[PDB]
Amino acid sequence: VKPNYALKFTLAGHTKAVSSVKFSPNGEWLASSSADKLIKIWGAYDGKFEKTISGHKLGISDVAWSSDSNLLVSASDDKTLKIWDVSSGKCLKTLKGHSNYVFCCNFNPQSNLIVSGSFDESVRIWDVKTGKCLKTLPAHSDPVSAVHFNRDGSLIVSSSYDGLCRIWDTASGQCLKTLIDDDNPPVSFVKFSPNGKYILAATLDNTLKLWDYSKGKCLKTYTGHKNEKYCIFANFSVTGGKWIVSGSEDNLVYIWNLQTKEIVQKLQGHTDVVISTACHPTENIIASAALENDKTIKLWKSDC
Numbered sequence: 546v547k548p549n550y551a552l553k554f555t556l557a558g559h560t561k562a563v564s565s566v567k568f569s570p571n572g573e574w575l576a577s578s579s580a581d582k583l584i585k586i587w588g589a590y591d592g593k594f595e596k597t598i599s600g601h602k603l604g605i606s607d608v609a610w611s612s613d614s615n616l617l618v619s620a621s622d623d624k625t626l627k628i629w630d631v632s633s634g635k636c637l638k639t640l641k642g643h644s645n646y647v648f649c650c651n652f653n654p655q656s657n658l659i660v661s662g663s664f665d666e667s668v669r670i671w672d673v674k675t676g677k678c679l680k681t682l683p684a685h686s687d688p689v690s691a692v693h694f695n696r697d698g699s700l701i702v703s704s705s706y707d708g709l710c711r712i713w714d715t716a717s718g719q720c721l722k723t724l725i726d727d728d729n730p731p732v733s734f735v736k737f738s739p740n741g742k743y744i745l746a747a748t749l750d751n752t753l754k755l756w757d758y759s760k761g762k763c764l765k766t767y768t769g770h771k772n773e774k775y776c777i778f779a780n781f782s783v784t785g786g787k788w789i790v791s792g793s794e795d796n797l798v799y800i801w802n803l804q805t806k807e808i809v810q811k812l813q814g815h816t817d818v819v820i821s822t823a824c825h826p827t828e829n830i831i832a833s834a835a836l837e838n839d840k841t842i843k844l845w846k847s848d849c
């Protein structure tokens with residue numbers, strides 16, 4: 546009914562704020578991106594540093610894995626995304642088209658496509674093999690904070706400081722849905738649930754909400770943490786108990802019971818804002834990463 550996540554490893558190496566951490570789908574690796582313009586790879590189970598991947602000319606806000614765990618895509622302040630072959634370290638493609646900072650990115654499950662969101666208020670859909678932009682979506686009227694494909698890649702969800710979450714048809718580019726609550730504070734993060742029936746959205750009023758989007762209504766609300774300034778990732782934890790996991794501006798990792806909405810654990814250790822968390826695909830392992838005054842990544846493990 547409660548997990549018992551405890552610190553196992555602290556991963557040090559980035560020289561500026563860490564922006565994002567993601568587990569490879571095959572569970573072997575952790576990738577991290579940073580304001581220090583670098584991507585670093587780490588052992589998911591031992592926390593052992595593996596390699597550094599370089600090339601962006603400015604800081605990196607996001608990194609994501611392909612489904613086969615062989616490629617990474619990164620989103621940078623240099624207005625580009627880059628596709629990387631992880632084993633060789635080579636930049637396969639540089640995706641050019643955004644006219645300002647690229648803030649978020651993801652592969653679709655088939656991993657033939659990349660979606661990106663930018664400060665330029667647009668969402669773009671890219672072809673992985675050619676590196677060319679397929680669609681530019683006039684998605685929002687403020688910076689785009691997050692983009693995510695659903696389980697079969699037919700849908701994209703985006704969020705923005707303009708207070709909206711929007712659902713897009715991947716194939717046509719048409720806006721299928723706009724989610725409005727009773728109010729519209731900036732939306733700082735969004736992603737589909739594993740089954741694709743729900744979306745989880747963070748707003749900069751210290752609140753996480755679980756939405757049934759097809760019915761366009763809020764089902765759950767998660768509070769207790771602090772989130773008023775940063776685009777903090779949130780996760781569905783599914784390997785053990787069903788949790789909601791998120792970072793917080795009080796330097797803690799918050800874990801909620803998905804159903805009761807109660808806080809079931811708060812992980813202490815970081816010394817600055819926890820901007821990013823990730824959940825291991827098969828083991829009860831959480832990765833967390835923190836901002837400039839901390840710079841470390843932490844690996845936590847629970848027995849349930």
Ligand SMILES: Clc1ccc(OCCCNc2ncc[nH]2)c(Cl)c1
Nearest residue numbers: 562563564580606607648649690776
């Ligand atoms: Cl001061 C500051 C401000 C922002 C930063 O990273 C961007 C936020 C985290 N990325 C993200 N959230 C959702 C999609 N990508 C960092 Cl590293 C430092």
